[PDB]
Amino acid sequence: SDRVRSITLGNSTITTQECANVVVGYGVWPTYLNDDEATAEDQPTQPDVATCRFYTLESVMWQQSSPGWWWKFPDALSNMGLFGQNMQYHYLGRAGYTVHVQCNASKFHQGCLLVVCVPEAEMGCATLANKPDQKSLSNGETANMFESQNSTGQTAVQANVINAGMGVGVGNLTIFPHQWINLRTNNSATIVMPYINSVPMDNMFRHNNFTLMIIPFAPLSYSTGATTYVPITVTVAPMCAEYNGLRLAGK
Amino acid sequence: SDRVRSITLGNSTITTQECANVVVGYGVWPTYLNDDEATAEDQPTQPDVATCRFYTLESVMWQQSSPGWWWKFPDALSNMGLFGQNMQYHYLGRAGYTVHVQCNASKFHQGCLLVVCVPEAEMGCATLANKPDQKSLSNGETANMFESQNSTGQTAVQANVINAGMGVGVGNLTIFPHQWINLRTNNSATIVMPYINSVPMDNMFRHNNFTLMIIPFAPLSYSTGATTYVPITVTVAPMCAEYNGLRLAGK
Amino acid sequence: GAQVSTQKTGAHEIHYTNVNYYKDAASNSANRQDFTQDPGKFTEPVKDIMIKSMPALN
Amino acid sequence: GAQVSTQKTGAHEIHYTNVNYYKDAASNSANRQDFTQDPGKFTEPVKDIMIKSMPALN
Amino acid sequence: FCGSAMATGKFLLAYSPPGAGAPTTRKEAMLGTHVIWDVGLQSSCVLCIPWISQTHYRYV
Amino acid sequence: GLPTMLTPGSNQFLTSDDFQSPSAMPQFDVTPEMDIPGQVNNLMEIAEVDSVVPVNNTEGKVLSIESYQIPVQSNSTNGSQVFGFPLMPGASSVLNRTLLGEILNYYTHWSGSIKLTFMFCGSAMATGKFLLAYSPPGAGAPTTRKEAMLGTHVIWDVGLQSSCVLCIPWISQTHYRYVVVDEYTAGGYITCWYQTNIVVPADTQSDCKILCFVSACNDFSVRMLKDTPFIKQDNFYQ
Amino acid sequence: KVLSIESYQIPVQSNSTNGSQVFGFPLMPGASSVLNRTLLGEILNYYTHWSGSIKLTFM
Amino acid sequence: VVDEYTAGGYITCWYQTNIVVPADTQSDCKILCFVSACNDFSVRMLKDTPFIKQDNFYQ
Amino acid sequence: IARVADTIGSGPVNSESIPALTAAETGHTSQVVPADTMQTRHVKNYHSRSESTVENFLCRSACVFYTTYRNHGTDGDNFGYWVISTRQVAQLRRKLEMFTYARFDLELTFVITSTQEQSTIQGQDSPVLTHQIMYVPPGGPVPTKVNSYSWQTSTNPSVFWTEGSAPPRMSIPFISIGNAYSMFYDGWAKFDKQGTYGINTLNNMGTLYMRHVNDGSPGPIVSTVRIYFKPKHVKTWVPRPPRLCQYQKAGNVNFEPTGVTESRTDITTMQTT
Ligand SMILES: CCCCCCCCCCCCCCCC(=O)O
Ligand SMILES: CCCCCCCCCCCCCC(=O)O
Ligand SMILES: CCCCCCCCCCCCCC(=O)O
């Protein structure tokens, strides 16, 4: 039916028997930069198979008091195979992403997760005068956790989930490309993100520029005697990745 | 859908709401012997309704430590209605079989049964010098049970399930027409078996020549408080049964 | 009555002759090149067509 | 299927027949008269044509 | 079948014309006209009792 | 010369080979052929001829002409047996020495239908009805007339036509059978009973003789030539 | 397990950690003891060379 | 046969998530493996098997 | 041509079609190719399945028996015999038994070798030896002595062979009374089910008899004849799993229960092997 779906990228495949649909960005499928949009003159690199493939991040464990998590991209993929390698040797880069969040339950479990990709998600620090340090913003392959109370710390991020680290209403995050994992309905959510930026290409190490947030709006719940370990796995795949500006490796 | 199915033979009918499919032998539907394949000259008998119908054997009870069962045919039908009668009064016979194995569970039960029809399933004795006696090979309408350990006995059959009584690998039995009853998927399995033999007709009392095996590869399992009595019923129907060589009754 | 057939050669960059000498067909040589294949008997013995991309069970 | 070829004879002042008996092409006899020559691979592997009478380097 | 949705069963609905007694075991009932009923999403099943008599009509 | 390779079987003497050899008498002029009566092209033309069966081959009768005579008499009971023997034309002593059985013993396999003709060699004033039955294997041999009529049979009424034929049809699971006795290729049983009595007037003999003949039908065939166990020899005949 | 039907059964259970291994074996259909006794591996042992793609179905 | 020049690789299975089950259900489950060749599979150079042996003639 | 399938090119996919998911309960073996679960290139495959045909797999000469006979004997009683069967050797029996039914012609070859025995009969200068193999079909007269009348071979086929020459060979057609040779039989010989059970019920092929055609010389000599079978013009039906347990008898399928495979340390050890 329309609940089944498969996605093959590179030498990787993801099957889902209980999905909702695919959310495709803003109706735009990711493509390669055209000649009339390009400004960098050297012939770009396009690995096209070794990089445009699925990578699985580190899983988290959904608990009854989990406020939520977030990843930064492509910082989360900065050490993933040849995709991270091309990022180090190149000054400029460009990709779109297929994002697949997967969480299965027992049909007696309940809870609803919001899965959203926020472009240019600039986050505030817990101390108003300071700035968040590098690790609080993006731990790479590891998720940074939202809090269900005000954060403290000179370099900490204001990770109170009610504002989503950005100073907005967390219920208003549905303006971005989003989906819901509702345990009674579906065990996965997938979003295809095109490349969004104010320039045709950017440095992949000092800019993201979208964040993945997973926020439980309905908490996890079950009766005693059921499985209590409900993990959420994240599998991202860059699409149409190209690179410009080859030189020595860094960072 | 394709999970429902009905089979009407004679004055009998079997409905199934949760099946997988029908396995038809080696792609051959059973038929009557043709003039250019026949060698016996007398006009054969074809009851065609009173014999080509469904017969239900004796049920067994699936337990958590059941190695498996087996029936021999048409010895299992040798006392079933008019099909057994025509077998006694005739020297030669010929039939194909629809086999329907049925086992239902509670959707909290688990276990996987292999249902296979083995042509010419010659079985070995527990004592290497001797031969298995008549009852160990085929109890007729009653199932002979596999063991989960080496058998003993002068006339006993070597019923250790790991070799399936034949001296082969039990996991390699899928070369024959087979099916699986997986309790989470389907509650029945059906196989249509044509007549397979090196002669156009044979004596139905001194030759089988296929066996039905039901081997649980995944054991039966459930949590306490669930139903613990899970029976397996077998319903076979001869197809296109014809008979030659009428004389006094025997055996 | 001589039969000229194609020898077994390699692919990606060659005939032999045969005469039968005896009156019985069993005296002939082996049918070394009878290449026929029908795996569907054993791999797809089911009644319905069972297309690949479709779900096996509804 | 008999192949009549030219024997190896002398120049400046003669066929044989061949029949294949076996089904494999490896059972045949050697290709004693496969006269092909392409020495340019090893003697002139350079990119430019390098005419003889001209100077090799300007 | 007015039981639960988690319950499952198979039932043999049999009809036997007269001439012998009433069947006393399932082995004797399957010789007659019957329908094996598998419970599931379709909750009902029909056993059609065909008209097998020697006369055209019967007495009430 | 022509290059050639010797293969297995060279310089071997196989007694059933078809080769050409040189004639030790070149240009010999054979006698002109003559039209002789009774030319035989197939051995099956000999098996298809009737030959008397020694059904009464008991311990004393076998050295006498009384072996062929099947005794039938007037009885006081009903349904008695007259004779019975198994359908083994190659192995049974009731059949293996006839023209059909003598030819079978040179072969390993047979197949086809058999005829059993019966001539009633009693008086013209005698009358009888006989049940000639054949029963395929799988059950035992019938022991009463009630069990013989379930099988293949012919009720024989004696009269102006003195003979009757019981055609033993070919009912087996294989295409051929073994001339030797084998349980896999059992053939069945031929039996004869009284359908009525031998009723005779006064001053007539109640005891009569019946004769048996056995010949093959037009679908009969043999296979795999062998030597006979019937002829032997210790040393060369001088 | 090798003398029992439990050889074919691959145990999977609910865990408390994340990313555990379930099984692992080498791709040697002719030599590996995990494969050389199946219908595919039993046929390979009559031959010296193989080639092609393999399917691994999981129920 | 096993040869280092023609190594084949490794087949592994991991948990992408957990086996999540409701109450009154068995957390322990079984999985089954099947192996079959694809339509591009092929073998070559017939040999004898190391699987069957014999010391003397079967009587 | 038994040419395998080419690999088709396939790019990325995102759709509802699920080639990797199926129901193995159906008994259907999935027809997934590598081009369904990954981006493949185009490969023109020129590999052929010409060597796995049942004719090529079975058309190999195999020794099925050997026996010995002497020249002196008593009295004698110096000759050999073999009741023909294909189940006294392990190697050819396992190949033939991968199928339930087979029809084929045979190529029969013999390899006869003679050996000098220990003695003190010096000096010995013995002319070349000649052997006679006689085949007696079921029911024919059997040789009782090394010089009995049955060796006349008036109707029984026999091959005479002198040592030092090519091993003798002859072809046999398909000779069974059934429509196919049976490797397996799941019934008895008698209708009451007493007696022989299994494939021995259908074993009625005949017997071979061997002797020296020469009169015995003073020096003792023992000859051994090796019989070789070669299936030809093969047709097989109903393949079955290969024999896993070691054979024990020729007449039956009796076995000693064997493990499914070779064991290893744990479920994840890559040392296999
Ligand atoms: C002079 C040499 C003649 C010998 C002729 C030998 C003929 C015997 C038959 C050989 C075929 C037996 C094949 C049986 C197959 C089986 O039982 O599976
Ligand atoms: C195995 C190669 C055999 C070569 C040919 C040698 C045998 C004689 C061939 C005679 C050809 C003419 C016969 C015919 O008309 O078919
Ligand atoms: C090496 C010289 C071989 C001489 C020829 C002997 C072999 C038989 C030739 C038969 C020719 C007819 C066959 C054909 O049609 O090609």
Tab-separated table of N, CA and C in Angstrom, chain A residues 98-141:
chain	number	residue	atom	x	y	z
A	98	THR	N	18.247	13.168	2.345
A	98	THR	CA	17.119	12.344	2.745
A	98	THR	C	17.325	12.002	4.213
A	99	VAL	N	16.335	12.312	5.040
A	99	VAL	CA	16.400	12.070	6.473
A	99	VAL	C	15.356	11.018	6.810
A	100	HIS	N	15.775	9.969	7.509
A	100	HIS	CA	14.877	8.893	7.902
A	100	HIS	C	15.017	8.661	9.397
A	101	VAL	N	14.000	9.057	10.153
A	101	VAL	CA	13.934	8.820	11.588
A	101	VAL	C	13.045	7.609	11.808
A	102	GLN	N	13.502	6.678	12.638
A	102	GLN	CA	12.832	5.394	12.803
A	102	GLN	C	12.700	5.062	14.282
A	103	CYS	N	11.465	4.820	14.714
A	103	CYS	CA	11.138	4.434	16.079
A	103	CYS	C	9.938	3.504	16.042
A	104	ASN	N	10.118	2.276	16.513
A	104	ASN	CA	9.041	1.302	16.536
A	104	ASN	C	8.619	1.018	17.972
A	105	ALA	N	7.346	0.673	18.139
A	105	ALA	CA	6.766	0.373	19.437
A	105	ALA	C	5.964	-0.918	19.344
A	106	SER	N	5.165	-1.176	20.376
A	106	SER	CA	4.513	-2.468	20.551
A	106	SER	C	3.008	-2.439	20.331
A	107	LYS	N	2.444	-1.322	19.872
A	107	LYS	CA	1.009	-1.176	19.623
A	107	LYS	C	0.209	-1.049	20.919
A	108	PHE	N	0.866	-1.234	22.059
A	108	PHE	CA	0.355	-0.816	23.353
A	108	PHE	C	1.081	0.417	23.862
A	109	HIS	N	2.122	0.848	23.162
A	109	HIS	CA	2.874	2.049	23.481
A	109	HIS	C	2.176	3.261	22.883
A	110	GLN	N	2.407	4.422	23.486
A	110	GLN	CA	1.838	5.662	22.985
A	110	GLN	C	2.866	6.776	23.115
A	111	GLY	N	2.670	7.817	22.330
A	111	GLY	CA	3.578	8.945	22.269
A	111	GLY	C	3.695	9.449	20.844
A	112	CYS	N	3.895	10.758	20.715
A	112	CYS	CA	4.001	11.413	19.418
A	112	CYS	C	5.257	12.269	19.373
A	113	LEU	N	6.098	12.024	18.374
A	113	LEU	CA	7.324	12.777	18.159
A	113	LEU	C	7.148	13.717	16.978
A	114	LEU	N	7.611	14.951	17.131
A	114	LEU	CA	7.718	15.893	16.026
A	114	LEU	C	9.115	15.778	15.432
A	115	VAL	N	9.185	15.553	14.125
A	115	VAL	CA	10.445	15.444	13.399
A	115	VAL	C	10.461	16.567	12.374
A	116	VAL	N	11.378	17.513	12.542
A	116	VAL	CA	11.408	18.716	11.724
A	116	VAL	C	12.852	19.046	11.380
A	117	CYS	N	13.043	19.640	10.206
A	117	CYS	CA	14.340	20.122	9.759
A	117	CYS	C	14.287	21.639	9.666
A	118	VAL	N	15.034	22.312	10.529
A	118	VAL	CA	14.981	23.764	10.663
A	118	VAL	C	16.167	24.360	9.915
A	119	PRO	N	15.947	25.087	8.823
A	119	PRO	CA	17.065	25.735	8.131
A	119	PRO	C	17.550	26.967	8.881
A	120	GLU	N	18.875	27.100	8.968
A	120	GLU	CA	19.521	28.239	9.625
A	120	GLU	C	19.083	28.366	11.080
A	121	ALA	N	19.193	27.268	11.826
A	121	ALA	CA	18.717	27.219	13.206
A	121	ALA	C	19.799	27.765	14.133
A	122	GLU	N	19.840	29.092	14.238
A	122	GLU	CA	20.766	29.751	15.148
A	122	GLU	C	20.228	29.698	16.573
A	123	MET	N	21.065	29.242	17.501
A	123	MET	CA	20.636	28.918	18.855
A	123	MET	C	21.257	29.886	19.851
A	124	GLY	N	20.526	30.168	20.927
A	124	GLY	CA	20.982	31.151	21.893
A	124	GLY	C	21.696	30.506	23.068
A	125	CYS	N	22.506	31.307	23.753
A	125	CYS	CA	23.263	30.819	24.892
A	125	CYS	C	22.490	31.039	26.189
A	126	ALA	N	22.848	30.258	27.210
A	126	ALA	CA	22.159	30.363	28.491
A	126	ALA	C	22.525	31.654	29.212
A	127	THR	N	23.737	32.152	28.995
A	127	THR	CA	24.158	33.450	29.500
A	127	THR	C	23.996	34.479	28.389
A	128	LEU	N	23.224	35.532	28.666
A	128	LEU	CA	22.812	36.452	27.609
A	128	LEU	C	23.995	37.206	27.016
A	129	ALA	N	25.053	37.408	27.801
A	129	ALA	CA	26.190	38.178	27.311
A	129	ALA	C	27.131	37.317	26.479
A	130	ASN	N	27.164	36.014	26.745
A	130	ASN	CA	28.143	35.138	26.124
A	130	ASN	C	27.598	34.548	24.825
A	131	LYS	N	28.347	33.599	24.269
A	131	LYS	CA	27.949	32.861	23.082
A	131	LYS	C	28.105	31.374	23.372
A	132	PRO	N	27.266	30.517	22.797
A	132	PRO	CA	27.413	29.078	23.036
A	132	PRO	C	28.701	28.550	22.423
A	133	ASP	N	29.399	27.710	23.180
A	133	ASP	CA	30.638	27.144	22.681
A	133	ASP	C	30.347	26.103	21.601
A	134	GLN	N	31.420	25.636	20.961
A	134	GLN	CA	31.288	24.820	19.759
A	134	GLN	C	30.608	23.485	20.042
A	135	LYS	N	30.846	22.906	21.220
A	135	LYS	CA	30.341	21.563	21.483
A	135	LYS	C	28.862	21.582	21.847
A	136	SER	N	28.407	22.643	22.513
A	136	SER	CA	27.000	22.722	22.891
A	136	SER	C	26.102	22.820	21.665
A	137	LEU	N	26.606	23.413	20.584
A	137	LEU	CA	25.789	23.575	19.388
A	137	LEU	C	25.651	22.266	18.627
A	138	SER	N	26.761	21.569	18.403
A	138	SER	CA	26.724	20.346	17.616
A	138	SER	C	27.799	19.391	18.109
A	139	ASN	N	27.367	18.253	18.649
A	139	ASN	CA	28.263	17.197	19.094
A	139	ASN	C	28.637	16.247	17.965
A	140	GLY	N	28.330	16.611	16.728
A	140	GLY	CA	28.650	15.741	15.613
A	140	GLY	C	27.643	14.619	15.494
A	141	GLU	N	28.143	13.387	15.588
A	141	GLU	CA	27.296	12.217	15.394
A	141	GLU	C	26.409	11.961	16.605
